[PDB]
Amino acid sequence: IRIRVVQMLGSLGGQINKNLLMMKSYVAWDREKRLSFAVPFREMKPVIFLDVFLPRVTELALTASDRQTKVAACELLHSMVMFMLGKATQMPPPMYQLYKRTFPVLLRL
Amino acid sequence: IRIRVVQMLGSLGGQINKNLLMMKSYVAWDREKRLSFAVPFREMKPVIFLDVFLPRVTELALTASDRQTKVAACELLHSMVMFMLGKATQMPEGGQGAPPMYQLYKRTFPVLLRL
Amino acid sequence: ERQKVCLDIIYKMMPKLKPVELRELLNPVVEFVSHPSTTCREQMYNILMWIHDNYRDTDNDSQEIFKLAKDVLIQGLIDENPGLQLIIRNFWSHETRLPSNTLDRLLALNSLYSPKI
To answer: Which chains have at least 3 CB atom pairs separated by less than 8 Å from chain A?
Structure first.
């Protein structure tokens, strides 16, 4: 499938193919890395802001070949959204922009 | 001072001294067990119910000689109430006005004001 | 069959072997990488684990032997067999070859690298 797909792509001619790709639509969705998570260890707990994975983890979980890959990605996405909505219990707009980003993705998935 | 106190007590005699002491002294403040805390370790996280120390420490914190001891008690009580107040958030509280801690308010607050 | 018996011979005889002989013994051993038999590659990796443990401590032949053994271990760290991959990972992820300290674990694993893995 992928071989024939790239073959067709080159068959079109790049003047059509460049349509594969303005406001440029990347602004680091939330100004605050509000996805703090200290990974367990036996000596320390380095903190990870899983925010950076958000777009990526969505798109792969949204569309991807290799059903194994897509299943793993969407399972991890389930876990992370599970966690963050658990993290919603916090100081009182928490993930307002994050919700804007994620909800359409969640519903399509 | 303590010597003279016990001297008085013996002087008064038993028929008087028994006036030292029905709700019958206790109600086991919370019908439940809560105020949990997992003590950290490199291998395990044993959980501890801090609430069990409240009736004692309060009496120690409210009433004590040994300025050192009383100060330690009150500082430790301040820490525990800070912790419990923080634990008030992040609680599922759909059964009472403050299910995970309501009676503890009743116990603490007069003591808090006295302190 | 000959592969397996040869490798078993090698595994039995290595403790008595001198490093200098072991060098040119192993040099024609290393080609059983990518060989299509899990038995061959697993006996390979057994030999290499023994060498690594017995040469992580001198004799420049022994030094190059140890370097080559670590290199081929890294080579094995990619496999068509998930089971081989798991077992060699357990070998590598073990504390003696990956320090228990996460800082030290990371620092040590930094060295382990090939421009093929």
So the answer is: B, C
